[PDB]
From Swiss-Prot, chain A:
Encoding gene per record: NOG1
UniProt record similarity statement: Belongs to the TRAFAC class OBG-HflX-like GTPase superfamily. OBG GTPase family. NOG subfamily.
Job of this protein: Involved in the biogenesis of the 60S ribosomal subunit.
Name of the protein: Nucleolar GTP-binding protein 1
Subcellular location: Nucleus, Nucleolus
Source organism superkingdom: Eukaryota
Length: 50, 171
RNA sequence: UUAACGAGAUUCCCACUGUCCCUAUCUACUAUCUAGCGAAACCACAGCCAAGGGAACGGGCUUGGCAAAAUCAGCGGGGAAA
RNA sequence: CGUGAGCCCGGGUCGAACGGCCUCUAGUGCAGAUCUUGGUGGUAGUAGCAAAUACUUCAAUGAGAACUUGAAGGACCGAAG
RNA sequence: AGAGACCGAUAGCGCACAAGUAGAGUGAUCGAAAGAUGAAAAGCACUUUGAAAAGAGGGUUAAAUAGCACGUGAAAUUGUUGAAAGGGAAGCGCUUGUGACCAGACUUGCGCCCGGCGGAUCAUCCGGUGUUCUCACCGGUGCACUCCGCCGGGCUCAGGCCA
């Protein structure tokens, strides 16, 4: 029963290991399409980045 | 478990398998195509020579902007490399298939690599940071490998044609 | 025709020198080759030219020149690329 | 088989429901919307992994040791470290 | 509390799930993704190869072509095997050819003339019944030159594809 228990614990980690999370506390959702990179236009005056 | 080559019966053949292996799929494909159809001991010696950089694997399909070497002349190419990690994974799988063949009682020294196939596994999804606060994928492309070792081994004529053949047979 | 002061703008002189005549050489880190790891931008389909293709435009059409696998380092004419 | 949108059958996979006809009904037919969401390529084993002087020998551990540890060396910070 | 010509997990409420959660923002606020092994865990004993993950045998199950990546398992895209093409694009239309792979059609039917079998649901008459009111069925009668099937021949006709 113990061996079955750690086997279940190890099989519970497969999706987060494929997502390459550092443990089960790694639940950060990053900005894949940030607004500052995907909106607005660049003029001759002040720009938002160099 | 189902292998790709279903025509090979398991009575006088051995097989080995590896899944979700974090080794480069392109390098592994080139190494597998290098050792395809070979004797087992010859394949093991070649893979050890690839690890020792004494013999090379030709890069044919996944070869874009790679270096050139004198060791591709054995294969008739110029682009060849030494993918030691793919060689190590394939050596482990080949030794497993050898052990399976010895368990079955087959003659190890007469075995050939009849089937070997590398597929793409689900990708390992890391992230990398770029300039201007951007994040891009930084994935690993792992592979499934499977291999199988095998012992080395006048009807409806016209009446005119019938008469012509009869006359030619008599004459 | 205002002294001092100024990372303000301008002309000249001496000194000085690879700015130049006119380029050469050396060192480090790259680029390069290998092991490991490994993106993105962009992408109708694709990519050799010449003349003609009324609407001053042809890469695909017409007529020619031609035309031989698979590749590596470079390059910045054209296509792409702000 | 039908000009056609489509319809029907055979073979394989599969496991719990479904169809013809006449009426009734509508959130009823996609290639485009720099469409939405999700997934996947070529590019491509490519660009790159080059600021902060620097690493080496033996032994041990271990399946495996440049980036573990002990010793032996060589260096750096140089008291606004 | 009861219902529906409603939706069937990108739909229906944002939420069928430890959802106003996880996460983000100083804050006011913003706000998801995410259902399905199997009837039953029976969730793989044991042996063997590996440092291990796993593999191979061998097992459970109706099925592992259902292995806690789990029903079915499409396309894009990828690997192996088999076939083919390629002198600066391929793809497409008309028509042959080669190779590979196939759907049909056909296999005999009908009608006479003989011979051999096996039976009397041959024509007429009688009675009953039903009907379309003149046509049938049922029971008796037939005594085998009459009817009905079978089996051998012979003959005529019609039969598939290309000429």
């Amino acid at each position: 029963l113990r061996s079955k228990a750690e086997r279940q614990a190890k099989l519970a980690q497969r999706k987060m290991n494929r997502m390459a999370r550092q443990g089960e506390a790694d639940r950060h959702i990053h900005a894949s399409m940030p607004k500052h990179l995907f909106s607005g236009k660049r003029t001759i005056g002040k720009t938002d980045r160099r | 478990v189902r292998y790709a080559a279903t025509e090979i019966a398991p009575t006088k053949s051995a097989r080995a398998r590896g899944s979700y292996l974090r080794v480069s799929f392109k390098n592994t494909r080139e190494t597998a195509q290098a050792i395809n159809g070979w004797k087992l001991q010859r394949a093991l010696t070649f893979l050890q020579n690839v690890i020792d950089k004494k013999e090379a694997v030709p890069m044919r399909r996944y070869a874009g902007s790679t270096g050139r070497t004198a060791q591709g002349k054995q294969w008739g190419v110029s682009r060849a490399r030494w993918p030691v990690k793919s060689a190590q994974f394939l050596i482990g799988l080949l030794k497993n298939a050898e052990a399976n063949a010895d368990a079955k009682g087959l003659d190890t020294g007469n075995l050939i690599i009849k089937h070997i196939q590398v597929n793409q596994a689900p990708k390992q999804r890391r992230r990398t940071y770029r300039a201007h606060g951007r994040i891009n994928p930084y994935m690993s492309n792992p592979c499934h490998i499977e291999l199988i070792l095998t012992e080395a081994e006048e009807s409806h004529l016209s009446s005119r044609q019938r008469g012509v053949r009869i006359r030619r047979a008599l004459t």
